[PDB]
């Protein structure tokens, strides 16, 4: 949770949104 195992950087306000991969594999931590 948090984005702590999906990317370094971590992200409390991705759990304030449904989706994940627009949020933290993208948004979070963009490729």
Do not use: K, M, V
Not at 5 to 31: A, D, K, T
């Amino acid at each position: 949770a948090d984005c702590t195992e999906y990317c370094s950087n971590s992200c409390p306000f991705c759990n304030g949104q449904p989706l994940y991969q627009l949020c933290c594999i993208n948004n979070c931590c963009p490729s």
